[PDB]
Structure formats: C-alpha cells, structure tokens
Amino acid sequence: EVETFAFQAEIAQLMSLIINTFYSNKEIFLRELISNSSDALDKIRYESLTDPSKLDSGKELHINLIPNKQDRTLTIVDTGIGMTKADLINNLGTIAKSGTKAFMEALQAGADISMIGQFGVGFYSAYLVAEKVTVITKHNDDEQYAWESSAGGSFTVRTDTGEPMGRGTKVILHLKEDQTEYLEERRIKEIVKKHSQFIGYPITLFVEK
C-alpha cells in the first residue's frame, strides 16, 4: 500500500531548479547529506542523556557510506533519531517552504547552490547527482517507512517491508549515468576529507569486493 503526495510548490520548484541547472560543483551533495546525518545523531544523543532507553534501538552512533556500482546507488546511513511518518507527510514537510523561498531569492541576488545548507534544505542537493532518492527511516515512536521521489513534483511514502533498522535513516541515491564518479573510493574519500573532516561521528566508507 503506497500513498502518493504532491510536493509543496516552492519545494517542487527547488528540485526542478537543482536537477536542470548546470552547476559543476556537484560534490557538495555529500557534505549536505552527512551534515544532516550529523544533525540526526545529535538529536538522539542529546535525548539519551535524560532517557537512556532511547538508545535501546541501537547504541552505536555513526555514519556509513555504501557505494554500489552494480545498482549505481550511493547509500548514506546514520543511526540518528530517524523520522516519523508525520515527518515525511506534514512535519518536516512544512520546515522547508520557508527555507526554499529564501534560497531561490538569494540565488538571484548573488548566492549559488553550494550555500543551500545555510537555508536548512540541503537534502535536495542529492538531486544534483541522483535521478531518484529512496529514503528508509526509523524513529523510536513510529514504524519503518520508505520515502522515495524522482522529483517531478510528487513523492511516495509506504510502510517498509525490508530489513528492519532499529533506528536511523538510510538515504539511497539512484545516481545519474553521468554521476558514477561518486561511487569511486578515492573520490568519496576526497570529498569527505575536504568537506566533512570535522564531523563528531565516525564516517565509515564501505569498500566493494
């Protein structure tokens, strides 16, 4: 059972801007995805300081990067707070309209795409490199859900049936044919060292066999 929802017009307008505009500095998508993973870990960590039972769904706080040349997917995983169904449909949905509007205004007043983090909507930079993003998330107070969107103004949300997660969020990036450089090891390691060297959580790069 899959529910399809329409993007908010501002947020739909941003991903059409991101996918279609030529902008060679595509690598900032990883810095934004890891930063949101670092933000998710901060929330579950701070919450466990008063309620240690919140970490019962996974004590380890880390970030993994799983490139897959066969599936052409770059997968970013964290064990952070995750997201409820209200985060996908509703809650987190409404915390981007304001950030999206302010970002496109600045884009015509000098600013460029690499500043998308300063507006709290850095996730949509994933569509620089990805033609489709599937997101698997798990919050302590909700079931497991799969979020997915090829942009195009809509997204889907379904109750996930795959491997249980415990807690955290997995972001699967179905990469464009012209974006396979971000499945290379030495390319991933260079962006992580360049952009996310001061992240307070271990970023493990999984190597393919």
Ligand SMILES: Cc1cc(Oc2ccc(N)cn2)ccc1Cl
């Ligand atoms: C369902 C939804 C998702 C959304 O954007 C994000 C943000 C972060 C992650 N991990 C996935 N999608 C923005 C608006 C909506 Cl309505």
